[PDB]
């Protein structure tokens, strides 16, 4: 059995995820955001979402401290995100996906594009001279509908898996996703968190929703 965790990621502040492939002009942008190559639609890579969620959850579950290596995290994190250790390989019960922004029509109703330009600078404390940059940033109010695949392997510890999934989601809500988060950017929110059966039906699927929506 396999389950699909749907939901939406709503940007609270501007969100920047780096990665640059071509044509950064000399007066326009210095750090573009990652975009879907075909449709040019900005996206949240599943790698970055998975990594931030794993970091926050592993730090929270262990002791509040996290200095180890990913293949030596706690057993919940190891069983939910995977482990490549030689003799102890845990197959990941989560398959994150790349997350394109869904409410572009809603944004176009407000006569705005999905990305803004943010003008920053650093001020040399010696001479008080400013060095300007130009960060492309996905505007607040953008919504990213996602889908995370959960491989239902153990029928009994699925509840603890989903409690930790919700805990990691809530840790992201009080943190940033991608880019210069401590300097204002990156704030996000989660909504419409619902798990559904990929094929067939699961006995505790009404329980797994109420431990996701609450």
């Amino acid at each position: 059995m396999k389950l699909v965790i749907e939901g939406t990621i709503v940007l609270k502040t501007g969100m920047h995820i780096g990665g640059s492939s071509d044509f950064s002009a000399i007066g326009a942008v210095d750090s573009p955001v990652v975009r879907d190559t075909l449709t040019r639609l900005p996206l949240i890579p599943g790698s970055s979402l998975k990594g931030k969620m794993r970091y926050l959850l592993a730090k929270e579950l262990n002791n509040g401290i996290l200095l180890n290596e990913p293949n030596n995290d706690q057993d919940e994190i190891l069983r939910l995100f995977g482990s490549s250790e030689k003799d102890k390989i845990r197959r990941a019960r989560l398959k994150f996906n790349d997350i394109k922004l869904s409410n572009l029509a809603e944004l176009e109703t407000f006569n705005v594009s999905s990305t803004e330009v943010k003008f920053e600078n650093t001020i040399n404390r010696k001479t008080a001279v400013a060095n300007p940059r130009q960060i492309e940033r996905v505007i607040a109010g953008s919504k990213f509908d996602f889908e995370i695949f959960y491989n239902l392997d153990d029928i009994k510890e699925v509840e603890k898996d989903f409690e930790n999934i919700k805990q990691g989601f809530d840790l992201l809500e009080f943190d940033y996703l991608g880019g210069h988060g401590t300097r204002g950017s990156g704030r996000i929110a989660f909504e419409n968190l619902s798990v559904i059966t990929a094929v067939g039906n699961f006995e505790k699927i009404n329980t797994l929703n109420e431990i996701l929506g609450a």
């Binding site: 326009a28 990305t115 330009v117």
Partner: peptide
Amino acid sequence: NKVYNRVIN
């Protein structure tokens, strides 16, 4: 750059 930043995307 004002117009290029919106054309390029």
